[PDB]
Amino acid sequence: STGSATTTPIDSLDDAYITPVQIGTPAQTLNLDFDTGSSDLWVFSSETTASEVDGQTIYTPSKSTTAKLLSGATWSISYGDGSSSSGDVYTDTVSVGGLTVTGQAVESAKKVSSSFTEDSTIDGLLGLAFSTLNTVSPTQQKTFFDNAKASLDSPVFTADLGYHAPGTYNFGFIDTTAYTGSITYTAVSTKQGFWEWTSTGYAVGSGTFKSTSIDGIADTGTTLLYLPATVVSAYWAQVSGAKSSSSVGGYVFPCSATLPSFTFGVGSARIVIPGDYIDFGPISTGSSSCFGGIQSSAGIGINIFGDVALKAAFVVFNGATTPTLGFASK
Numbered sequence: 001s002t003g004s005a006t007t008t009p010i011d012s013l014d015d016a017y018i019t020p021v022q023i024g025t026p027a028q029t030l031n032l033d034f035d036t037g038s039s040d041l042w043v044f045s046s047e048t049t050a051s052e053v054d055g056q057t058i059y060t061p062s063k064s065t066t067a068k069l070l071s072g073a074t075w076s077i078s079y080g081d082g083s084s085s086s087g088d089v090y091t092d093t094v095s096v097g098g099l100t101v102t103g104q105a106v107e108s109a110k111k112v113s114s115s116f117t118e119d120s121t122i123d124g125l126l127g128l129a130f131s132t133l134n135t136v137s138p139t140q141q142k143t144f145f146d147n148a149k150a151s152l153d154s155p156v157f158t159a160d161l162g163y164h165a166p167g168t169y170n171f172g173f174i175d176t177t178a179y180t181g182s183i184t185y186t187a188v189s190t191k192q193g194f195w196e197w198t199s200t201g202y203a204v205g206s207g208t209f210k211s212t213s214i215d216g217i218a219d220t221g222t223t224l225l226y227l228p229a230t231v232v233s234a235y236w237a238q239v240s241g242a243k244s245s246s247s248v249g250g251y252v253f254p255c256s257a258t259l260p261s262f263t264f265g266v267g268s269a270r271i272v273i274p275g276d277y278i279d280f281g282p283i284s285t286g287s288s289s290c291f292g293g294i295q296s297s298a299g300i301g302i303n304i305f306g307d308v309a310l311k312a313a314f315v316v317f318n319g320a321t322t323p324t325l326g327f328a329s330k
Contacts (some may be wrong), residue, residue: 001151002172003099007034007161010121013280015223017161018121020168020318023106024064024093030057030123034329035221036159036317037144039133040077041094042085042107043124052112061108067092068242074282075107075135080222080300085112089136092142094144095309096126099171102146105141124227125221128157128317133193145171145319155319159220160330161311163277179314179328184269188323194219195317199305200225200267204235205260209270216303218310218317218325224280225262225273226297226304235262235294242292248283255282262294264309266327273312
């Protein structure tokens with residue numbers, strides 16, 4: 001089997017991407033944030049505290065003939081941005097782009113933090129990291145991908161995120177028309193539960209490539225590219241007037257600037273992030289200070305190849321017995 005679903009930016013900045021997902025019988029379609037940095041499939045629901053729902057579409061398990069309470073199971077998750085959610089668990093049929101999993105754990109939110117409530121476009125998350133990170137207790141649950149894997153033509157999914165445009169998540173096949181040149185594969189460590197890999201270095205603009213190992217995670221659920229302070233300083237030093245602002249929470253630059261590209265290494269291959277991808281616009285409406293899309297990972301504890309980086313590539317998440325990651329230009 002295979003699946004193929006279009007993923008769409010939630011706003012003009014590509015802050016996140018939503019993908020329609022069919023849950024239950026008859027289908028209830030919710031728009032979920034596919035997150036390769038976490039491992040819970042959770043949804044706004046008929047159980048979510050009413051004051052914490054503001055425009056989201058909710059899953060109502062009582063209206064699904066295939067929903068079953070997973071008795072005694074609870075979940076609670078905190079994300080890197082400080083947001084959080086928790087609740088109880090149903091099993092139900094879940095389909096993505098024509099690919100169906102029966103008995104999927106669908107984590108129903110009883111509580112969500114402010115950032116979730118305030119984002120009316122995101123009806124929940126669909127985790128695509130390794131199932132070892134799943135938060136369901138006392139019986140940990142599998143991700144949608146883990147459940148689908150045995151039925152898939154090939155044990156893979158791909159992320160093809162657009163810049164200011166829709167893109168695609170495919171399950172079970174590699175669309176050879178969706179990228180240019182060849183795919184370069186690189187080793188993954190699952191030790192921390194993430195799609196963790198080591199970039200071979202970077203370049204700023206037309207500068208020389210610096211060969212250096214950068215361990216980080218491929219995380220579709222993080223907007224920006226978070227890298228070591230040395231790397232980030234080298235990038236922003238090439239933008240006149242750019243500076244790190246403690247008050248704003250990172251590097252800012254004059255909105256009048258033209259940003260250089262940023263290249264990262266994948267083995268001997270090179271992925272180029274155009275300068276425009278690194279512009280996250282005014283820090284507040286009407287400001288002439290713009291927020292940067294490359295930020296320091298210092299104090300996160302991990303480097304994160306988020307959407308800024310991933311959207312510059314066609315990315316293969318190979319979930320074979322020995323997992324790997326592939327990157328191609330597109």
